[PDB]
Design a protein around this ligand. Structure first.
Ligand SMILES: [Zn+2]
Lengths: 123, 241, 95, 108
RNA sequence: CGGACGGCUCAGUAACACGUCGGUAACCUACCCUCGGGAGGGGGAUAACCCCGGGAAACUGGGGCUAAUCCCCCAUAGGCCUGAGGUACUGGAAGGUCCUCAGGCCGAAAGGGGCAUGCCCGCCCGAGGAUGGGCCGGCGGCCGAUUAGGUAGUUGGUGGGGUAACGGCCCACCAAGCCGAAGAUCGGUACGGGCCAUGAGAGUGGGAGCCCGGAGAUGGACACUGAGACACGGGUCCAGGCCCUAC
C-alpha cells in the first residue's frame, strides 16, 4: 500500500492518491531516476489532476519515505537502511557551518517498508 | 585552558602609567590595538570622565564622543577604546581647550595645556626606514605611523631624527637631527621627564643598545638609552614642556 | 533651613550647569526635594522644570547636609542625557 | 662576513652553510667562554664552565659546573683541552643551539 | 559579526610546566592605526512564500517562484619558486628588503546601503606597527641507595619530506655515541609563583579563597568550520551509567 504524491512541473500543484494490490508490486524493485507510465498502475490523470492532461505521459520517481519516518537518498544503493554521517541533503538540514550528524536514511530502491512515494509528471 | 586571544582586563592588572582606582571595581576598559603600546597609552573615555570630568558615567562619554566634540591629532575619534599617547594633542573646540600628553617624573601620563598655535604641530621620532616598490623610502615613526619620501633626499632622514608635521594634513616642516648639542626629553626609564642637551654617544657589541649622556641646565649629568631620548630642539625647545 | 551655594560649574558638551550646595538645618530633619528645588530656583532664577536633584545627603552628626543639582537648557537634551529613575524620583515624568 | 664580536677570523675556509664565518648561519643572544671536555662526535663539541653558588643559610659557597653542546665547523676544529668562545644561535639539532666562533688557547 | 573571552575546579604533571633575564636574521595574527593604490565584464542557485505530505516522536521528503554586502567564472593588480646580475636600505652582523632581466604555478574586490542636491557607514591588495600567541636558550627552586647502571630513533652527521616556522618531528644511508656517586634511571608525594602563619632575629612550615601563568570538562581516542579550537552549555566511535517509546 502506497500513498502517491503526484506533482506537475507545469502549474506547481500536486495531488495525493492511493495504490494497493498487484499494481503496487510493479514498483518494488524500481529505483529513483526511472520512468513509469501511469496506466501501468491503474489510474488516469485527467480524472484527478483536474481539467486535462494528455495520454502517453509517464511518471518519474523522485523520492519517498519509510514507515518510520526515514527518507530515501538516491546515492545509497539498496532497499535497506544505513547510518552514514552525511553533511548536506537530502535527509539532513545543517543549521550551522561545518555541522555533521550521523543520520538514518533509506536506500535508492523501493520496498514494502515504504508508505510515501513522490512522482513527477513528464511531458 | 586558553584557545584564543583575550578581550577583558581587570583593574588590578592595568598598567602603572594610569591614574585609576584599582579596588573600586573589578573591570577596566581594554584598549584596542592602535598607534602606541599598552604601557604607553590610555584610552579616551578615561580622559573624558576621570581627568577632565565632563561626564560621570560612560553613557554620557559615549554620547559626547559620537558627536565629534573631541579631536585627537586634528581628527575626530568616536571610539572609547582608542589609545592616546605621548606627544599627542587633545582638542575640544567647543571649549577652546588644547592639551598635550606627556609623562611625569614618576612615569604617569598627564595633560599639559597649550595654545591653539602649538596645537597644530606634532613632533615625530623616526624609528626605522625601508625601501618600498617604486624605489621610494618609507619612514616608520614612533606612533606606528608611516611617511613616504623620495630617493633623492634619503641621506637627510635617519633613524633617530625628529620631524615636525602639521597634524591633519601631515606636511613636514623643520627636521631636527641627532647631534652633540641637541635638546632632549626623556620618555621612559628611571630619568623620565628630564630634559637637557646631548654630550656623548656610546655603542656596544652584539645586540646591546646604544647609550647616551645628557647634561641638565643645572649642570648635572645622567645617562640613558638612545631610543628614549626624544629630540625636540637644537638649542631650545620648539614645544611647551 | 538655609541653602548656601558652594560651587557652580559649566558644561558646554552636554549643555548643563552643575551645582554643589550645602543645606543647613539645625534642629530640623533632613528637608525635602520639593523645598530644596523651590529655594534653588527662587535664588538662582531657574526654571522649576529643566532642573533635577541628583542627591541630598546627610552625615553622622552635622545638621548640615549636602546636595548636587543639574540645570539643563532644554527639556529635550534633558530627557536625552538623564536617565528615567531620577526623573521619576523628582516628579518631572510619570512612569 | 664580519660577525659582531670583535675577534679574529680563522685562517681557513669552508663550504658548510652552517658556519658563522663563511656561511649563512647567524648568531645572536649571549656568548661565553669554556673548556672542551669531549669531541667524540662529528662536528660537535662539549663545552664546560664553572661558577659559584651562594648558600644564604650557611653563609658559604658551592662550586657548580655547566655543560653545553656546540656546533664545531671545520675551519675552527677544536679538540679536548682548548679554551674556546661559544655563541648562541637557532636550534641546529635536538640538543645543539650554540656554535664555536674562535679558539682562545689551544692545548698541546 | 560573535559564541576560542568571561565563569568553575585541582584530577593529572618533578616538566623549559613556573619565575627572571634574553632571543626569533626560524614564525602566524579577524576586530584596530598610518601611508600608498584599486573597485572593470559577465552568470547561477536556493531558503522564506504556494500545492501535497510522511513519522509516536526526535527529525524530515517532492514539485513551483524569487533576492542579496550569498555562490561561481573571465580580466587586471598582486602572491610564491628558481637562475643570472646591480649594490639603493636597515641593522652589531643579511639565506632579508629595493633595481634589471628570464622561465613558470596560484590568482582579488560590495561603489553596496543611508541622507541629500556632496557628507555618514563600508569592500579588496600592499608595506609597517600594535594586540594576542607558537618556538629556543642561560640561571633558580622536594624526599628516597633496604632504588646502581640506564638508552637502541637511542646521541651525532649527509641528503631530503613535512610544518606558519628551527628541529630525529618523521624517512633513507654512514658512524658509535649520550646520561651517571657533584646520584643517572626508577619509585613516592605534589599544579607553579607573587604571597601567608610563626618567631627578637637567623630560621622552620604551608601555598583553597584575591592577581599573573598552566591544565582539565564522565575515562579515552579522532575529526569539521573558522584569524584562532581537536572546542564545558557544537560533532564521531568504544567502554561504563541513566532516560522517553506506539518496541
Ligand atoms: Zn667557516
Amino acid at each position: 500500500t502506497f500513498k502517491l504524491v503526484i506533482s506537475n512541473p507545469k502549474n506547481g500543484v500536486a495531488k495525493q492518491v492511493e495504490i494497493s494490490g498487484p499494481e503496487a508490486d510493479k514498483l518494488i524493485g524500481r529505483r529513483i531516476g526511472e520512468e513509469i507510465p501511469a496506466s501501468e498502475l491503474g489510474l488516469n490523470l485527467s480524472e484527478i489532476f483536474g481539467e486535462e492532461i494528455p495520454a502517453d505521459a509517464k511518471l518519474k520517481i523522485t523520492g519517498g519515505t519509510d514507515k518510520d519516518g526515514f527518507p530515501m537518498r538516491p546515492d545509497v544503493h539498496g532497499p535497506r537502511r544505513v547510518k552514514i554521517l552525511l553533511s548536506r541533503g537530502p535527509g539532513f538540514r545543517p543549521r550551522e557551518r561545518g555541522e555533521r550528524r550521523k543520520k538514518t536514511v533509506h536506500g535508492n530502491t523501493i520496498s514494502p517498508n515504504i508508505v510515501q512515494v513522490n512522482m513527477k509528471i513528464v511531458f | 585552558a586558553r584557545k584564543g586571544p583575550k578581550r577583558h582586563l581587570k583593574r588590578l592588572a592595568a598598567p602603572t602609567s594610569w591614574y585609576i582606582h584599582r579596588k573600586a571595581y573589578k573591570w577596566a576598559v581594554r584598549p584596542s590595538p592602535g598607534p602606541h603600546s599598552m604601557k604607553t597609552s590610555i584610552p579616551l573615555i578615561y580622559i573624558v570622565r576621570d581627568y577632565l570630568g565632563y561626564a560621570k558615567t560612560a553613557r554620557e562619554a559615549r554620547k559626547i564622543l559620537n558627536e565629534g566634540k573631541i579631536l585627537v591629532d586634528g581628527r575626530v575619534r568616536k571610539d572609547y577604546k582608542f589609545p592616546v599617547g605621548i606627544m599627542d594633542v587633545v582638542s575640544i573646540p567647543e571649549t577652546g581647550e588644547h592639551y598635550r600628553v606627556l609623562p611625569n617624573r614618576i612615569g604617569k601620563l598627564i595633560l599639559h595645556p597649550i595654545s591653539e598655535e602649538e596645537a597644530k604641530l606634532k613632533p615625530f621620532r623616526i624609528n626605522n626606514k625601508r625601501m618600498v616598490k617604486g624605489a621610494k623610502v618609507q619612514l616608520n615613526l614612533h606612533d606606528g605611523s608611516n611617511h613616504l619620501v623620495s630617493l633623492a633626499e634619503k641621506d637627510a632622514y635617519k633613524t633617530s631624527y625628529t620631524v615636525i608635521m602639521q597634524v591633519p594634513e601631515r606636511q613636514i616642516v623643520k627636521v631636527l637631527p641627532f647631534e652633540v648639542g641637541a635638546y632632549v626629553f626623556v620618555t621612559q626609564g628611571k630619568n623620565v621627564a628630564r630634559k637637557g642637551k646631548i654630550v656623548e654617544v656610546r655603542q656596544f657589541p652584539m645586540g646591546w643598545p646604544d647609550v647616551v649622556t645628557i647634561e641638565d641646565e643645572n649642570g648635572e649629568l645622567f645617562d640613558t638609552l638612545k631610543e628614549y631620548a626624544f629630540v625636540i630642539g637644537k638649542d631650545k625647545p620648539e614645544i611647551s614642556l | 533651613m538655609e541653602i548656601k551655594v558652594t560651587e557652580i560649574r559649566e558644561n558646554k558638551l552636554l549643555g548643563r550647569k552643575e551645582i554643589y550646595f550645602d543645606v543647613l538645618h539645625e534642629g530640623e530633619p533632613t528637608p525635602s526635594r520639593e523645598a530644596v528645588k523651590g529655594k534653588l530656583v527662587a535664588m538662582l532664577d531657574l526654571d522649576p522644570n529643566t532642573t533635577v536633584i541628583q542627591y541630598i545627603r546627610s552625615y553622622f552628626g552635622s545638621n548640615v547636609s549636602k546636595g548636587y543639582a543639574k540645570a539643563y537648557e532644554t527639556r529635550e537634551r534633558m530627557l536625552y542625557i538623564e536617565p528615567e529613575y531620577i526623573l521619576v524620583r523628582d516628579g518631572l515624568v510619570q512612569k | 662576513r664580519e660577525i659582531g664580536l670583535r675577534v679574529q677570523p680563522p685562517a681557513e675556509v669552508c663550504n658548510d652553510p652552517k658556519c658563522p664565518w663563511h656561511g649563512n648561519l647567524k648568531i645572536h643572544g649571549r656568548y661565553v667562554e669554556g673548556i672542551v671536555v669531549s669531541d667524540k662526535g662529528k662536528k660537535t663539541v662539549v663545552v664546560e664552565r664553572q661558577y659559584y653558588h651562594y648558600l644564604k643559610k650557611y653563609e658559604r659557597y658551592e662550586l657548580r659546573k655547566s655543560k653545553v653542546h656546540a656546533h664545531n665547523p671545520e675551519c675552527i676544529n677544536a679538540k679536548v683541552g682548548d679554551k674556546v668562545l661559544i655563541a648562541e644561535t637557532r636550534p641546529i639539532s635536538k640538543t645543539k643551539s650554540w656554535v664555536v666562533v674562535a679558539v682562545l688557547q689551544r692545548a698541546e
